[PDB]
C-alpha cells in the first residue's frame, strides 16, 4: 500500500464499494479511513480483486 | 442473490409519518433494511423509500447502484404490490424466462424464502 501512496495514487472507487460490502460483513470497523480498513482486510488475508 | 438483509441499526423504532422514517434514515439514525414500525404496521425504510413500477425499473436501479439485490424493497409485479428484494424478482424472472410461462412460473416458486 505505502508504495501506492508514494506513487501518487489514492483509494479507488471500486475499493470503496468493496469496503462498504465488507463493512456490512463485519470484516472491518465502521468509521475508520479506507486505508485502515484495507489493512484490516489484508490482516485477514483478504484483498480487493 | 435470494437472501435478504437484516440490519441492527434501526432496532425497531416507532414512527408516525413515513417522512420521519426517511428523515431519520437520512440522519443515519435508522438503517435501510432494519425492522421498524411506521404507524401500526411493521415495515422497513427501504420498502417506503424505493417503490418500483415493475421489475425492469428495480433491476435498472440495481445496475446504477441505487440498491443491491439483497435490499428489501417494494416492487409492482403482475398487478400486485410486493415487498421483497430485487434479487428474488430476478430469480422469478429467471425461472419465468427459462420455462416461457409467466403464470405457471409464478405459481411454482416460493418467493418469500
Amino acid at each position: 500500500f505505502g508504495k501506492r501512496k508514494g506513487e501518487g495514487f489514492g483509494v479507488d472507487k471500486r475499493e470503496v464499494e468493496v469496503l462498504r460490502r465488507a463493512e456490512k460483513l463485519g470484516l472491518v470497523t465502521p468509521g475508520k479511513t479506507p486505508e485502515e480498513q484495507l489493512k484490516e482486510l489484508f490482516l485477514q488475508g483478504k484483498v480487493v480483486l | 442473490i435470494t437472501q435478504v438483509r437484516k440490519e441492527k441499526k434501526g432496532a425497531g423504532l416507532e414512527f408516525a409519518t413515513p417522512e420521519e422514517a426517511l428523515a431519520a434514515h437520512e440522519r443515519g439514525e435508522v438503517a435501510l433494511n432494519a425492522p421498524i414500525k411506521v404507524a401500526g404496521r411493521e415495515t422497513s425504510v427501504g420498502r417506503l423509500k424505493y417503490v418500483f413500477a415493475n421489475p425492469d425499473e428495480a433491476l435498472l436501479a440495481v445496475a446504477h447502484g441505487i440498491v443491491d439485490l439483497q435490499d428489501v424493497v417494494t416492487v409492482r409485479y403482475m398487478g400486485k404490490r410486493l415487498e421483497t428484494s430485487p434479487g428474488r424478482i430476478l430469480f422469478a424472472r429467471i425461472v419465468a424466462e427459462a420455462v416461457e410461462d409467466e403464470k405457471v412460473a409464478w405459481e411454482l416458486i416460493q418467493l418469500d424464502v
Binding site: R4, D12, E15, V47, V48, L49 | -
Partner: protein, 48 residues
C-alpha cells in the same frame, strides 16, 4: 518430450487438495490485484 500443463492434468497441494485443470484462461480474463497483478490459480472455497 517436453510436457506443458494442459487441461486434464492433475494438480495438488500438501493438504490433500487435489483437482484436474478444467480451464486455462488468457491473462486478461484472470482476476487481478488493483496494481494489475493477475492471480495464477483459482481454487473453489467449497472444497475447504
Amino acid at each position: 518430450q517436453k510436457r506443458k500443463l494442459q487441461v486434464g492434468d492433475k494438480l495438488a497441494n500438501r493438504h490433500g487438495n487435489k483437482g484436474v485443470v478444467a480451464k486455462i484462461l488468457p491473462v486478461e480474463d484472470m482476476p487481478h490485484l488493483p496494481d494489475g497483478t493477475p492471480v495464477d490459480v483459482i481454487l473453489n472455497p467449497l472444497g475447504v
